[PDB]
Amino acid sequence: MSFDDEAGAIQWFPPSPGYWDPLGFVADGDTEKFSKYRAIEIKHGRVAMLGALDYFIKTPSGWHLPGKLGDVDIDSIPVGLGAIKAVPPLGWVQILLFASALEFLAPQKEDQPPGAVQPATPSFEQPGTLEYQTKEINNGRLAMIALAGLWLGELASGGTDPIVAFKTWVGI
Amino acid sequence: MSFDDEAGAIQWFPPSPGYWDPLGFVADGDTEKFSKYRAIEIKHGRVAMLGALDYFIKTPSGWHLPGKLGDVDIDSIPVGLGAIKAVPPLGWVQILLFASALEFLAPQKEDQPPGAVQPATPSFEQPGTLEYQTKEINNGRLAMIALAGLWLGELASGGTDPIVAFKTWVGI
Amino acid sequence: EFPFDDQPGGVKWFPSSAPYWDPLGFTNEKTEDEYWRIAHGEIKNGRLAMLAVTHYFVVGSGLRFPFKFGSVSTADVPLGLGAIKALPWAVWLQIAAFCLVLEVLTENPGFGERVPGRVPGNLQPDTPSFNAPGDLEIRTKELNNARLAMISIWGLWVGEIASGGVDPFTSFANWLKL
Amino acid sequence: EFPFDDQPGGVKWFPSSAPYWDPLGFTNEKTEDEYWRIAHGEIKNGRLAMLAVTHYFVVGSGLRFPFKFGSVSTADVPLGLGAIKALPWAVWLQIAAFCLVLEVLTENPGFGERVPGRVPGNLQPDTPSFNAPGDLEIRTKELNNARLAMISIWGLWVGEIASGGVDPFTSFANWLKL
Ligand SMILES: CC(/C=C/C=C(C)/C=C/[C@@]12O[C@]1(C)C[C@@H](O)CC2(C)C)=C\C=C\C=C(C)\C=C\C=C(C)\C=C\[C@@]12O[C@]1(C)C[C@@H](O)CC2(C)C
């Protein structure tokens, strides 16, 4: 149960516990359930970081790849969930196959720390300092929350652009 | 000649001497001529700091005391050397008398460090840390240069407002 | 015995009066930590009030930064309570967030309670540039100015409402027939 | 012997070639400190060129900060050498002053010369956040990108003059018939 010194452990206040887990998911201190949960959290955060980069490289700048994606206009592909059906099914299949191949080629080994899935090479540092592990986990949490709130909020507003909605909300 | 560790000692470059004195005014290391020179520099810098505050509390804000200064309109008193004749001679005499009384009441004692002329009291720290002594000397040097360049430059430009002249010079 | 007579802020009205003012006995039977927290809260409330009244003094003199918060400029933000709704809520949120950041950086051990070796109100992180503690006289001066500011900010608020929105300095001049 | 074969940046054209390229023998009979300063200068020139070409890439993609330097906005500052006179001289002076501040903060011992224990180009102040030295491979990658940037910034300059002011990317597309 030595989760106070783990990466991404948030102590809200000085009297607060060393980490945050109000539902007691790792209250026993399994040290193996926690490793699985941290691998899951890291993977979710990295996927969401890539998704947020996709969202914020497109709007409000309007940038997109020129041309067509298999008889489909790229400028006709929206930003957000509306692009799920706009993108051709074959393109989604290819992207899913690429991600599946990445998972197969770079799986999680029990000897390596959770999230250290990149194959070992001198160029790529692993597992990094605890400061950088915490930074990765925190930016991943932010991207996770951000994409959840993009999806829930694009449906609620009827499809408003997230940048336009934020500008209206904060008056800029 | 231990002037490398004195306050306001500027080493331009790592290979440069510890302090700056190209004319060799304290090259012998009198330690008494240097103290007199530092008292002079400190007094000049503090007077110039007050003068710069006067200059920059008036322009471009336009602030001045309301009313008249002995049958002379305060709004008719310019900013700069043109105020030397605009201000009544009696007012200048009173200001000079105030400064002379300050000098008489707070002279430089040989037991105290140079510039430590304020009478001893628990409220007023003396002589301050070397960091604050250096800060005082540096801001005083800046105010000294600034008022010299205000006077030489108000005559050269024919009386242009210093803020207006600077804005024209840099383009703002 | 007056246990808190060694703390700054004690006002002695008369030579025969108590060393500090406490008619309702708010400090009776209070330990060192309880009075420490009360004094800490006094200093924080007073510093906040001093900053607020300084805002009133600076803006009421006509001075304003050339800031443009979205579609609202500083010239469209009234002096007084009317700035609560006129200023965009995002600016208010960011100011509150800055205050929270300062609280995090200055109350990390204490969380508003006593930190051993630190007097109440000594919140600036230790550094040679900032002569932090000071003597009792300067601490009492800060406390008295803070109390004056707390009185004055509420005098501004209740008094802007009573006057119906009259400028505080204009109202002061009118009441004094200046 | 090749005394500087343990330094990054050595390009080996052929398996039978010298470990690093120096046809004119600029490194012959040079001590450790002399080559150290030469490599330090190479790294600084290359980093400056990388920043310059990154400016060209960012501005040429249409991206611009909403900055207003006096009466001149970023949309009125041309991409290329024409920005030398179009941008106000005060902005140029402030950029040079920022570079001088960085030089003061990073060359305080060395003044551009060797500092014991530091490889050439290791100018970032030591901190756990910044993994400063790196291995020889990443250092060679930085050096090669820097050399490419030094070639490319001069290709931009000489080539904007030759084309008569044609946009570098438009000129590149036209020359490639894109
Ligand atoms: C610049 C200056 C001195 C500069 C000296 C320098 C650089 C010396 C350099 C060197 O010696 C060293 C260090 C070491 C040597 O080896 C080499 C040299 C090179 C020799 C002093 C200014 C000193 C400047 C001073 C004291 C200024 C005082 C200003 C006052 C009183 C202003 C008053 C008013 O402006 C108001 C406020 C309002 C207006 O309306 C009316 C008036 C009256 C105009």
Coordinates of C-alpha atoms in Angstrom, one line a residue, chain B residues 18-135:
Chain B
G18 CA 36.5 43.1 -10.0
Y19 CA 35.5 46.8 -10.2
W20 CA 35.5 49.5 -12.8
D21 CA 37.9 52.5 -12.7
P22 CA 39.7 53.1 -16.0
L23 CA 41.1 56.4 -14.9
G24 CA 42.7 55.0 -11.7
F25 CA 41.0 57.3 -9.2
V26 CA 41.4 54.7 -6.4
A27 CA 44.2 52.7 -8.0
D28 CA 46.4 53.3 -4.9
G29 CA 43.8 51.8 -2.6
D30 CA 43.5 54.8 -0.3
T31 CA 40.3 53.3 1.4
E32 CA 39.6 56.9 2.5
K33 CA 39.4 58.5 -0.9
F34 CA 37.2 55.6 -2.0
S35 CA 34.9 56.1 1.0
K36 CA 34.5 59.8 0.1
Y37 CA 33.9 58.9 -3.6
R38 CA 31.3 56.3 -2.6
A39 CA 29.5 58.8 -0.3
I40 CA 29.5 61.3 -3.2
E41 CA 28.2 58.7 -5.6
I42 CA 25.5 57.6 -3.2
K43 CA 24.4 61.2 -2.6
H44 CA 24.3 62.0 -6.3
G45 CA 22.3 58.8 -7.0
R46 CA 19.7 59.5 -4.3
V47 CA 19.3 63.1 -5.4
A48 CA 18.9 61.9 -9.0
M49 CA 16.4 59.2 -7.9
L50 CA 14.2 61.9 -6.3
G51 CA 14.6 64.0 -9.5
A52 CA 13.6 61.1 -11.7
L53 CA 10.6 60.4 -9.6
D54 CA 9.6 64.1 -10.0
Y55 CA 10.1 63.8 -13.8
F56 CA 8.1 60.6 -14.2
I57 CA 5.3 61.4 -11.8
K58 CA 4.4 64.4 -14.0
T59 CA 4.7 63.1 -17.6
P60 CA 2.9 61.8 -19.6
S61 CA 0.3 61.6 -16.8
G62 CA 0.0 65.4 -16.4
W63 CA -0.2 65.2 -12.6
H64 CA 0.7 68.3 -10.6
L65 CA -0.4 69.9 -7.4
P66 CA -3.7 71.9 -7.9
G67 CA -3.7 75.7 -7.3
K68 CA -0.9 78.3 -7.3
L69 CA 2.6 78.5 -5.9
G70 CA 2.8 82.1 -4.7
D71 CA 0.8 83.9 -7.4
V72 CA 2.3 81.4 -10.0
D73 CA 0.0 78.9 -11.7
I74 CA 1.3 75.3 -11.1
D75 CA -0.2 74.2 -14.4
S76 CA 2.0 76.9 -16.0
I77 CA 5.2 75.3 -14.5
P78 CA 6.7 73.0 -17.1
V79 CA 8.5 69.6 -16.8
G80 CA 12.2 70.0 -16.9
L81 CA 14.7 72.8 -16.9
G82 CA 12.0 75.3 -18.0
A83 CA 10.6 75.0 -14.5
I84 CA 13.7 76.5 -13.0
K85 CA 12.5 80.0 -13.9
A86 CA 8.8 79.2 -13.7
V87 CA 9.0 78.2 -10.1
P88 CA 9.2 81.4 -7.9
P89 CA 12.7 82.2 -6.6
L90 CA 11.3 82.1 -3.0
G91 CA 10.1 78.5 -3.5
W92 CA 13.6 77.5 -4.8
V93 CA 15.1 79.3 -1.8
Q94 CA 12.8 77.3 0.6
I95 CA 13.7 74.0 -1.1
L96 CA 17.4 74.8 -1.0
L97 CA 17.0 75.7 2.7
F98 CA 15.2 72.4 3.4
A99 CA 18.0 70.5 1.7
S100 CA 20.7 72.5 3.6
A101 CA 18.9 71.8 6.9
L102 CA 18.7 68.1 6.0
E103 CA 22.5 68.1 5.3
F104 CA 23.2 69.9 8.6
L105 CA 21.0 67.6 10.6
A106 CA 22.1 64.4 8.9
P107 CA 25.8 64.8 8.0
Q108 CA 28.3 62.0 7.2
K109 CA 30.1 60.7 10.2
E110 CA 33.5 58.9 9.8
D111 CA 32.4 56.0 12.1
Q112 CA 29.4 55.2 9.9
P113 CA 29.6 53.6 6.4
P114 CA 29.5 56.0 3.5
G115 CA 25.9 57.0 2.7
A116 CA 24.6 55.9 6.1
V117 CA 23.5 59.5 6.9
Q118 CA 20.0 58.9 8.3
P119 CA 20.1 59.2 12.1
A120 CA 20.2 55.9 13.9
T121 CA 16.8 54.5 14.8
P122 CA 15.4 51.0 15.1
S123 CA 12.8 51.7 12.3
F124 CA 15.5 52.5 9.7
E125 CA 17.9 49.7 8.8
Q126 CA 21.6 50.6 8.4
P127 CA 23.6 50.1 6.4
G128 CA 21.5 47.3 4.8
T129 CA 22.7 44.2 3.1
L130 CA 25.3 44.4 0.3
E131 CA 22.6 43.3 -2.1
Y132 CA 20.5 46.3 -1.2
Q133 CA 23.5 48.6 -1.1
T134 CA 24.3 47.5 -4.7
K135 CA 20.7 48.0 -5.7

